[PDB]
Amino acid sequence: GGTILVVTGTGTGVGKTVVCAALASAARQAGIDVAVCKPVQTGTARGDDDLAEVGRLAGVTQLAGLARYPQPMAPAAAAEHAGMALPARDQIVRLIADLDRPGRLTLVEGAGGLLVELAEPGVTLRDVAVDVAAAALVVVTADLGTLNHTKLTLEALAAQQVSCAGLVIGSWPDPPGLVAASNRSALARIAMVRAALPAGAASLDAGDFAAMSAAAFDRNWVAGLV
Amino acid sequence: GGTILVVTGTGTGVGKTVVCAALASAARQAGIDVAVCKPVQTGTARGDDDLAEVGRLAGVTQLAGLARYPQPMAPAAAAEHAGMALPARDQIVRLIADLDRPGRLTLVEGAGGLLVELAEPGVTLRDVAVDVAAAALVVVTADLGTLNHTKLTLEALAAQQVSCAGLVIGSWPDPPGLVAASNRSALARIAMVRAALPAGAASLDAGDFAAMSAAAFDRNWVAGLVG
Numbered sequence: 001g002g003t004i005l006v007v008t009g010t011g012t013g014v015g016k017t018v019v020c021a022a023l024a025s026a027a028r029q030a031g032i033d034v035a036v037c038k039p040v041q042t043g044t045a046r047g048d049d050d051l052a053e054v055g056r057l058a059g060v061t062q063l064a065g066l067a068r069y070p071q072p073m074a075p076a077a078a079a080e081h082a083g084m085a086l087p088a089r090d091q092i093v094r095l096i097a098d099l100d101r102p103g104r105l106t107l108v109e110g111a112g113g114l115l116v117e118l119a120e121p122g123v124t125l126r127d128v129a130v131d132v133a134a135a136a137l138v139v140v141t142a143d144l145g146t147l148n149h150t151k152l153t154l155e156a157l158a159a160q161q162v163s164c165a166g167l168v169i170g171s172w173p174d175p176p177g178l179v180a181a182s183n184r185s186a187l188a189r190i191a192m193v194r195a196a197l198p199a200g201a202a203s204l205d206a207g208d209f210a211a212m213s214a215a216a217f218d219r220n221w222v223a224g225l226v
Numbered sequence: 227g228g229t230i231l232v233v234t235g236t237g238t239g240v241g242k243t244v245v246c247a248a249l250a251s252a253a254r255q256a257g258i259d260v261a262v263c264k265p266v267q268t269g270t271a272r273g274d275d276d277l278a279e280v281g282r283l284a285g286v287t288q289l290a291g292l293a294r295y296p297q298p299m300a301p302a303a304a305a306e307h308a309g310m311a312l313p314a315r316d317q318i319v320r321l322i323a324d325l326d327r328p329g330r331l332t333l334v335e336g337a338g339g340l341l342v343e344l345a346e347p348g349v350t351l352r353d354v355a356v357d358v359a360a361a362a363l364v365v366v367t368a369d370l371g372t373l374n375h376t377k378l379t380l381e382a383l384a385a386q387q388v389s390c391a392g393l394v395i396g397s398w399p400d401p402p403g404l405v406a407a408s409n410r411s412a413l414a415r416i417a418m419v420r421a422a423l424p425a426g427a428a429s430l431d432a433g434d435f436a437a438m439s440a441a442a443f444d445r446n447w448v449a450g451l452v453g
């Protein structure tokens with residue numbers, strides 16, 4: 001096998017997709033083969049497609065998914081509004097395990113936060129992480145309230161013995177501000193801050209995003225992932 | 227002693243203060259003596275005074291504060307900016323113990339979410355609730371992402387055997403969209419929703435706020451809080 005990392009977040013809209021793209025770009029530039037799995041995607045009616053984002057930003061081609069739901073809701077709510085169940089737990093775990101191979105970094109992007117239901121009955125990305133023996137990278141914001149949501153998420157990981165690979169601030173503001181600067185210092189006292197992506201990084205073209213990603217992550221940490 | 231309830235939330239600005247006032251108002255209309263304490267209050271340089279708001283909204287007179295910091299930040303950050311220390315864990319416990327009283331409902335309003343540090347080193351409202359054997363009333367939003375934060379908060383409570391007294395939706399929109407309606411039904415299956423306060427309840431005057439508060443909570447549940 002290779003390395004499987006679930007990329008979760010403290011909640012919704014925190015930067016999970018752009019962090020997945022940034023780490024994939026950084027890993028590829030270190031020579032690592034990268035695959036990204038988005039088991040469940042919602043909000044397709046308005047055009048949401050996180051895998052296509054990763055492919056355009058980081059050039060990844062191994063992009064695996066199982067289900068797409070039109071409504072921009074939690075997967076279980078989007079599934080219910082469409083009248084079709086979520087995928088099975090076996091579907092998600094086996095897709096991830098089949099993606100995994102030696103020399104490869106396989107990133108699993110969840111929907112919303114860690115305890116969001118992704119499969120029936122009540123299966124979350126935390127359950128998936130246990131099943132595939134993956135560590136968890138936690139995407140956090142720099143905004144008011146992030147320390148509480150980070151601590152809650154890390155405790156939920158530890159409660160099921162899921163290792164934490166570190167934190168990433170999904171959007172670092174410019175200029176930072178008092179709360180943002182205080183939060184970044186405190187976040188590093190909670191867990192290892194692997195990167196802070198500049199605000200607006202999701203809008204970069206592929207070449208600019210690759211330069212940003214290469215500078216945002218520590219090269220020794222990236223190469224050490226596989 | 228009486229009944230101590232810590233009033234926490236899934237995060238910052240979710241309605242902890244208005245829920246404290248609503249439950250205080252509902253208990254006072256049932257004849258229950260209510261005290262509300264605020265161990266750590268930040269944002270005083272902005273005029274934030276949750277105790278003053280609770281008294282203004284619900285008519286609570288027994289209001290007890292402890293630590294006050296100017297900046298509208300997390301307690302640890304607001305204290306550091308002011309060159310001040312956070313209170314001790316026992317100081318928060320003493321604040322609550324001196325209010326505790328048979329026949330009285332003592333609400334302990336937190337700052338931000340459950341794992342926010344209120345005392346050094348890393349002492350949170352969850353630790354306080356263990357010290358004073360209080361249940362925890364969790365204020366949640368109806369907005370996108372609330373189920374995850376609610377589940378995370380309830381799991382944190384269980385991890386230290388802090389009983390969950392229930393959930394309160396801090397602001398319930400009218401009319402509710404698909405997300406808000408979905409979230410409420412899902413929330414009611416995660417735990418018992420004690421009330422869903424209408425949006426803008428914080429802007430009601432004394433008379434209207436009391437009428438809203440009485441209608442928002444099950445009278446049997448409120449009455450059974452204190453014997």
Ligand SMILES: O=C(O)C[C@@H]1CCC[C@H]1C(=O)c1ccc(-c2nnn[nH]2)cc1
Nearest residue numbers: 012013043072074111112371372373374
């Ligand atoms: O992936 C994201 O974060 C953004 C997507 C964009 C479209 C919907 C978002 C989503 O999938 C989502 C996941 C969980 C929850 C939730 N958790 N607890 N209550 N509701 C809400 C939304």
Ligand SMILES: O=C(O)C[C@@H]1CCC[C@H]1C(=O)c1ccc(-c2nnn[nH]2)cc1
Nearest residue numbers: 145146147148238239269298300337338
């Ligand atoms: O009580 C509230 O929520 C509102 C008050 C109003 C003024 C600041 C708010 C506060 O006290 C507060 C508490 C914790 C955090 C936090 N948690 N994790 N990172 N930062 C942020 C703010």
